[PDB]
């Protein structure tokens, strides 16, 4: 029995929607003043699980409480199909007649994309007949009354193009994944009535750590965490086989109970296709945070929409370049992507172009560019452009170059790319896309001594000198940080692991100095040139 | 139910030729028996969606029903004659035709006939072939039906059984195309008739040429949306209440801001599934290239005189220039936009390959068949110096063969742009353009006057806003240093200049940003 109070973050959509079904039933003077007859159709579309059906449910439960009462008719996917010849095209006629009978009313076709395909001469004739009848009923010779029609879809572009037209489906709403702010609202909604109410700062801490969560996942963990406390509190519930009596007064949910949940479940977005955005792992942050910050500063310089009347920008492009093994293509760029949230990202990599056996690559490239143009601002991402170039045929090069030349100049679509070879060795076609004079090239340099010292500071001496369940190690740290002054990222994080293996090889020894010599031996056996 | 040939705007030929089939044989019956005519009694409307096909039938019914000469009216939906029993599918048709014959004169209106009369084939059910056979044996058979007028309407004309398209069954075919600049003013007039503060026609006239690509129903939407926007501008506390308020219907007047916002929030129904290859100059760039666009239009007026009847012979033209001068991305699309009312058929790289499930040659032939059918038109081939390198020999031969068979005097322009100068183009492309005839145009850089016009509004007016001798020095310096920059560099300089004006919004005193503007002027360097 939800009534415009279980939603969070969809405020303009609801405001526009109520203008379509509420006002003429309430203020029948302004419309008659001008002879308007407001729009009477809409189409929802967006990725799964973002609250497409809940809005319709809330609106239905809201308007049924008259006066003024409004009917409501629901239809599933393809319910009006029969094996007889003249039945499928008659149920719609019956339904529309019945709806006209009790006007005003609402007809909600649910997942219309499985009912009204694009007409073609190859598929069966029943579909063409049904779509013709459907679009003859909506706007025909005789005018329908106060019926209002709604649709749901996951793939917009597969609806017949004649249905989308002022008169039948004259407004399209985009339902997106929630941004940072809306996650807090959804969490407040789902944990409203709890006797030990959580504090809001805790909710914000949760919200800043949920990236890629879509409406139903947040609802999921709020119930996968209220069960961890139960399983911890009364561990002996699965053993017996009859109903017990409990003490439902000592099972409040602690902060820890949340953490395990975020470790176990994976968001709906990244279940069939991996996402090209990953935050820095807990070990390397004190090696690369500063470089990420500098990169974001420069991008802020050229792409002004990353600031947090409108800003004006002219074809933003940038290229992150350095010697091989400097973490440019495997640590830095995905970190930058993860830092700029609220801008959707479309990727372009060899595993993605050739990862589809049913569509040619140029089709995929065209689709990606069109989508990025549609929901701009956004990011088009292409990594390893020095290997990417000489794998693809000439047709795809020409197509890719001609598509991004048609994007309007002041439209905000960023082009982010990374490479290994220095800028001068790249093929000249790539060269005439980045204009460093304008500030579109960033060079990466190795971390300095302080930063590398911080990298090994917690390994030695805080874990090696921990009781199981103090002066030689300083010289050990000095010799370690002296030895590795010319190591790239791969070799550094290699040498981190070999020490931790010795750390783990001595769990239960209470006496040290049986491994300190082992440690200093291993560090001087390790040789990577 | 008060629409009668007076709410319909822009279609005069179709109305004029439609009343001489159903009005004249009744009213002046003494002219046709002299010659033994029996004037035509079958027509087929067709055209892209939302262009006013059902409106005409509504008007015609409403007109003929009320008057001195009464004519009946039977209406049918898509496939509303079907029944499950074997003997009833085609019996309703016979019942309807007999009933219409009994009350003659009368009219029959088949709506969405493409959903009832598919082209006969043996790859489907056989009931459809039975229905088609009884229909086309019933319209003109052995019985001479008499005074029955049959009408259809559809979007896909090519999917109708060809035995129904020949005189006797469906005589005339009517094309309903999108309105041009003049008819949009008529439609806007029609839809804003009963407004007490009547808008000035000097405002509608301006409003018309901004609505490019709109068609029919879209217009009727805008005239609605504006009103609602106006309401949002007057009583903004109305969306946050669950109880009726007291509204004063006297301060809900419509202003141009409402039209501007409502127009911005909407896209036309035509270019919603695809994108049209014609776009006007943006407001930012307009005072740099309008003169050049006018010059190009004058050359077209020289060789393509459709911009006694004018005569033309295989019109062609080629815009050429050094890279960056803006001929493939700023000039040619503007030319296509100005020459509207000429249907355009784009033909370049992402169109030929960017759609699968078809071969390049099929599309390459279809795009020219359509251009020939709807002459005059335009065939558009941008970036020829690359387009000629990415295709196989089969496509070259098919292309250079498909445009030789067009009738020599047919007015089918071929508009293309290049970047390498005409001498460096390969053979078979220098022979298609014969610049002695006047088929090559050389574009050149803008001179000083428009360059100064380009910057004065930003650096003189906008730089001094409420929330003055050094400005002239800045303007003269900027204009001077930039006497060899192409379009891309000029726009980039504009953007970097406006960035500081943005970033210093909230400081109540100037002279902190003037230094910024300076350093950006000095610290900006180009390549050339
Ligand atoms: N803002 C929100 N507040 C509360 N619940 C939400 C919100 N957004 C989404 N949901 C959840 O979304 C679920 C269903 O929404 P809806 O079915 O319309 O979208 P969807 O599941 O992503 O799409 P589809 O119907 O195509 O599968 C409900 O379980 C609801 O709890
Ligand atoms: N010239 C016009 N003046 C006013 N309204 C117009 C005009 N042309 C079209 N319309 C609008 O177009 C609407 C629909 O026209 P009509 O239904 O006959 O077109 P159609 O070809 O059948 O379109 P569809 O593809 O929707 O079937 C009318 O209700 C009217 O509001």
UniProtKB/Swiss-Prot annotation, chain A:
Outcome following mutation: residue 52 to T: Reduces the ability to mediate estradiol-dependent induction of CCND1 and E2F1
Binding site for ATP: 46-53
Expression induction: Up-regulated in breast, uterus, colon, ovary, and stomach tumors. Induced in breast cancer cells overexpressing NCOA3 or treated with estrogen. Down-regulated in 5-fluorouracil-resistant derivatives of the colon cancer cell line HCT 116.
Expression (tissue specificity): Highly expressed in estrogen receptor positive breast tumors and in osteosarcoma tumors.
Domain of life the protein comes from: Eukaryota
Subcellular location(s) per record: Nucleus
Subunit comment: Interacts with ESR1 and NCOA3 and these interactions are enhanced by estradiol. Interacts with acetylated lysine residues on histone H1.4, H2A, H2B and H3 (in vitro).
Designated name of the protein: ATPase family AAA domain-containing protein 2
Gene: ATAD2
């Amino acid at each position: 029995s939800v009534r415009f109070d279980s939603v969070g973050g969809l405020s303009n959509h609801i405001a526009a929607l109520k203008e379509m079904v509420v006002f003429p039933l309430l203020y029948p003077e302004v419309f008659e003043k001008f002879k308007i007859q407001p729009p009477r159709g809409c189409l929802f579309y967006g990725p799964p699980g973002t609250g497409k059906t809940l809005v319709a449910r809330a609106l239905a439960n809201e308007c049924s409480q008259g006066d003024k009462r409004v009917a409501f008719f629901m239809r599933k996917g393809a319910d009006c199909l029969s094996k007889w010849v003249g039945e499928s095209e008659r149920q719609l006629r019956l339904l529309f007649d019945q709806a006209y009978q009790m006007r005003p009313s609402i007809i909600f076709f649910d997942q219309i994309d499985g009912l009204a395909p694009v007409r073609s001469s190859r598929q069966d004739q029943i579909h063409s007949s049904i779509v013709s009848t459907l679009l003859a009923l909506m706007d025909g010779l005789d005018s329908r009354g106060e019926i209002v029609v709604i649709g749901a879809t996951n793939r917009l572009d597969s609806i017949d193009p004649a249905l989308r037209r002022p008169g039948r489906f004259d407004r399209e709403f985009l339902f997106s994944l929630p941004d940072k702010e809306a996650r807090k609202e959804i969490l407040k909604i789902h944990t409203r009535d709890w006797n030990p109410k959580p504090l809001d700062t805790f909710l914000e801490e949760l919200a800043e750590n949920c990236v890629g969560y879509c409406g139903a996942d947040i609802k999921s963990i709020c119930a996968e965490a209220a069960l961890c406390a139960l399983r911890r509190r009364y561990p002996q519930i699965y053993t017996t086989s009859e109903k017990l009596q409990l003490d439902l007064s000592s099972i409040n949910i602690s902060a820890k109970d949340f953490e395990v949940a975020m470790q176990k479940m994976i968001p709906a977005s990244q279940r069939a296709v991996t996402s090209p955005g990953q935050a820095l792992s807990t070990v390397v942050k004190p090696l690369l945070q500063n470089t990420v910050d500098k990169i974001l500063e420069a991008l802020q310089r050229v792409f002004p929409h990353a600031e947090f009347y409108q800003p004006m920008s002219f074809r933003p492009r940038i290229l992150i370049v350095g010697e091989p093994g400097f973490g440019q293509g495997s640590h830095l760029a995905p970190a930058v992507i993860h830092a700029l949230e609220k801008f959707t990202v479309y990727t372009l990599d060899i595993p993605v172009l050739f990862g589809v056996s049913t569509t040619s690559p140029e089709e995929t490239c065209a689709q990606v560019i069109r989508e990025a143009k549609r929901t701009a601002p956004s990011i088009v991402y292409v990594p390893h452009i020095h290997v990417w170039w000489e794998i693809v045929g000439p047709t795809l090069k020409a197509t890719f170059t001609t598509l991004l030349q048609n994007i309007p100049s002041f439209a905000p679509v960023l082009l982010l790319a990374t490479s290994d070879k220095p800028h001068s060795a790249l093929p000249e076609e790539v060269q005439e896309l980045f204009i460093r004079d304008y500030g579109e090239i960033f060079n990466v340099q190795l971390p300095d001594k302080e930063e590398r010292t911080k990298f090994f500071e917690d390994l030695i001496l805080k874990q090696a000198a921990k009781p199981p369940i103090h002066e030689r190690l300083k010289n050990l740290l000095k010799t370690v940080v002296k030895k590795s002054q010319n190591y790239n990222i791969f070799q550094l994080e290699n040498l981190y692991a070999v020490i931790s293996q010795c750390i783990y090889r001595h769990r239960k020894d209470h006496d040290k100095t049986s491994l300190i010599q082992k440690m200093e031996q291993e560090v001087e056996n390790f040789s990577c040139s």
